[PDB]
Symmetry: D2
Amino acid sequence: DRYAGVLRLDGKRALITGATKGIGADIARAFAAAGARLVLSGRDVSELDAARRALGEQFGTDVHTVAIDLAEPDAPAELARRAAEAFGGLDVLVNNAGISHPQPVVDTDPQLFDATIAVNLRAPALLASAVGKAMVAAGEGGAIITVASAAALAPLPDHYAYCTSKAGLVMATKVLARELGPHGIRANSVCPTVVLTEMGQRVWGDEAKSAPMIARIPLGRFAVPHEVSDAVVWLASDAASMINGVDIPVDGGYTMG
Amino acid sequence: DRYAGVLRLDGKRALITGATKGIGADIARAFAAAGARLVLSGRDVSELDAARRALGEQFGTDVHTVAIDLAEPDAPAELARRAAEAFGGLDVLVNNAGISHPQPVVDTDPQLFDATIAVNLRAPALLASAVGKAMVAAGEGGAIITVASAAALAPLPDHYAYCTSKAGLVMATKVLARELGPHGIRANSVCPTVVLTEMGQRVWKSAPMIARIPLGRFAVPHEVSDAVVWLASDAASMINGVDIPVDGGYTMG
Amino acid sequence: DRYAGVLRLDGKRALITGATKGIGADIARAFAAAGARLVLSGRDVSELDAARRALGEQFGTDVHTVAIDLAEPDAPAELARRAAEAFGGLDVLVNNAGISHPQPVVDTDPQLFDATIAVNLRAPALLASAVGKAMVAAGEGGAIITVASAAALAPLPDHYAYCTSKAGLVMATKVLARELGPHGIRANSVCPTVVLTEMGQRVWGDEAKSAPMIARIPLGRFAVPHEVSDAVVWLASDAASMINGVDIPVDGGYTMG
Amino acid sequence: DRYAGVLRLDGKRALITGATKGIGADIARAFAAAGARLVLSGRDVSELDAARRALGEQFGTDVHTVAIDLAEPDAPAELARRAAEAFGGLDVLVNNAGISHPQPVVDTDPQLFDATIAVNLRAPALLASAVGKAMVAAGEGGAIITVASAAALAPLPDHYAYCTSKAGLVMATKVLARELGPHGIRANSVCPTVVLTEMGQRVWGDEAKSAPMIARIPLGRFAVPHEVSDAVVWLASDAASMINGVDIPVDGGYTMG
């Protein structure tokens, strides 16, 4: 997965959330490789510093970091603004967030439900509406890519809150697609199955726990992170100039059922 | 809409939320006519008593009411519990709620968005899990019917929060179908277009919606009600994890 | 089960194809109990009169039969015409057809594929456009109900031609809904999983075959025939007066994936 | 929208059908630029010779042409065989066909319906099963990209046969994803809205006839040919390595509804 010709994003101004762990870090690394200028947000200052250092020396990338928790008061509006300001505008948002508190539906805990809605649905939704407003005012079109899940698309045991949150965000994405489309802004989601990030391996590593999952994936395996990143780079590029309002599963045929 | 034979809900114990206004009143009326025993919930004591009186007089229906604010803490779990105590278990949950704060996506207000999620998504979602846990434990199956919207299925301008919330509840409903299915519990959703309730007619601007409905009109309340009655009866005994647009063709696109 | 109140179909004139066996025979029984007047089609004249007899005997129903092979190019146009003559018009069309020639996709036989397409997709579509034309002309609305399968919504191994044909008809139905809706004609589909007709129980009787299909049905069983008939009677009745262009799975949750 | 890096198709062996006109010619141009080796099928010998020559002169591409009519006895399996023997195997099928006979459902003509099904559904499906057989047999994976339509996903007035045909092909494609996925074969569809090829421009150029259609596209325009080619190249690439059984609307948001 190297990015050249139409998959270059030289000079494109991209905010990427949860940029220092798992999927986010890999989309950040892809975008750096592809020539992007990056605003990277996250909860850990030193991870953000490592990230600036690494992507700078490895790709010469123009990187500005924002250490913020998107659950802090007014964080979506604050992060949107700071990000637009970093380079005089945003051309891309990668809306990346994810917690998961798995539980039988009969045992759903209200606190864990709410936490999951807060982090997976509320903050990404309001970051996107704010970013989108600034995209509309600036008049240079743009792209918004939601990192959702196959769980947005097909229900999963012990994933009541998770599934619920991701399915809502996905619909949130389509409203953006619908209203911001006429301004040349394109909003689409990527919907991965399990991704073998460090955390992914730790949680889905057991053969017999993951076996039922795998047997529902025709290609017979889980995703690796660069596969998600590929799809995001494509959606950001001019190779997706007509693509709007679409959910791309990265799931080896899982969601066909 | 007379409900006879298999569409009789004789003896079925049904919790219907938001029962005193809008579609929730109609569903309650239809279930009462069908022979159901009802637990009605809502915020206003007087309207609830009013309801209980209309339905007892008109249909000879057993009616218990729970005056509760679902936004208060553990309220969903409390309504579930109290609703089941009413007749020693629930056979049906009609998960009915709905508020709408239309605004352009560019102008989305966080408090109005938070409120839409709290009311259209959060409270129903947690009412359903608790109710389901009690259905699992009783061992007598059950039917959860979510009152969603065509807006859960297709984006609608000015409806960022509204569409998000309902799309979420529709997937919530699907996880119920997947995990509670084995225990003989069916979870399904009804997704109407604009419904010409009393407030429906006033609010619906409409020409472009109607252009998208092949049948050339919006739905009337009893049509949503028909669909819920069916989903709760033995004529839907195999129907699980399904979304029934009540929309004239709209969501075909 | 039993059809009263809004589910009466008294004096409704309904053409039901594949009416001599399985799902079609069960729908004919339901429509008969519901007080409908029936035009039944089928391949065998001897099986058709056994249907007229059993239905006349149980319910005293008006039954007219047409013996015809829908595999034939001219058949749908003949059946529409002949069905129209029985009772001077149609209120309800129930498109029930099915051959199934399962085989791995790598070994797909052209003839078998062609026969499946001819009977599962082409005959019903052309019968429907013809009955629709007449329903528009009469000016009294109508209901068209396609009996497809869960296989029209989700692909199933060994079912290349079967899935393909029923997915096509489910889209045909939708165009019917789009175009005939303005005239009061409702077009919808029912998409059952395996249904334990006498035949379905023979085909899926083997535990090693049924077990992985059942693993995917949250309700933990296949459908019985009246469960399908219930859906079709509902869709035909005033209880589904605003239902148009919908696919109803009768599948215990299978097509959620 | 040019193809380097992960979007190079150097070495890859690609059968593209309908390669002398419209979208197929643009895809073939695109794959030629990506450095693929091509097999190009079609009815006309005159035009195939010009493509072998034109693509040779501009790109240095290997082109085997196959002059064939797919309505012939066993013709699809033959093109599959001839196409694979050309370079000792196929890596990619771009299963491309399309005719359209628009007319109201009530006026649906049997022959015109049969010709739409024959060309849009039957030839392609039977080709793709033959191609898939040889891919399983060789054991080196593969990708099948179906060129369908937005009309596969949402019913369009006057497009009874067309919508139906395409929706079947989309399901065909999904059965292939499910059965051939375990062998590392990926099957997906692109589903464009109107595409402004020469004819496209001629049929939909009038801003009167096409206004209601554009109203329903959030980006406010139809697709141009290369936008379809980009989506196909992407799907053929290693940047789509986990993508299986997916429909990609190339439609500015139309099919969100």
